[PDB]
Every structure is written in structure tokens, then in C-alpha cells.
Curated annotation (Swiss-Prot):
It is found in: Membrane. Glycans are attached at residue 6. The WSXWS motif appears to be necessary for proper protein folding and thereby efficient intracellular transport and cell-surface receptor binding. The box 1 motif is required for JAK interaction and/or activation. Expressed in breast, placenta, kidney, liver and pancreas. This is Prolactin receptor. It is linked to Multiple fibroadenomas of the breast: A benign breast disease marked by lobuloalveolar growth with abnormally high proliferation of the epithelium, and characterized by the presence of more than 3 fibroadenomas in one breast. Fibroadenomas are adenomas containing fibrous tissue. Hyperprolactinemia: A disorder characterized by increased levels of prolactin in the blood not associated with gestation or the puerperium. HPRL may result in infertility, hypogonadism, and galactorrhea.
Amino acid sequence: GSFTMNDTTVWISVAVLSAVICLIIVWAVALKGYSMV
């Protein structure tokens, strides 16, 4: 399996990153003083 989608997916890969950075922020605030850090 090689070459399935055009340049479209190129941005999709970036689409997920946006969510990823959003995720780390969540933990970075629950791992920064949740109770007994």
C-alpha cells in the first residue's frame, strides 16, 4: 500500500497535532499540583 490521499492528508497529520498540544496542557495542569505532586 502506497499513496492513498493527495496533499490533503499532509494537513490532517497537522490537524491531530493541534489536538495533541491541547492534551498535554490538560495533564500539565493536573500533573503540576493536583493534590500531592
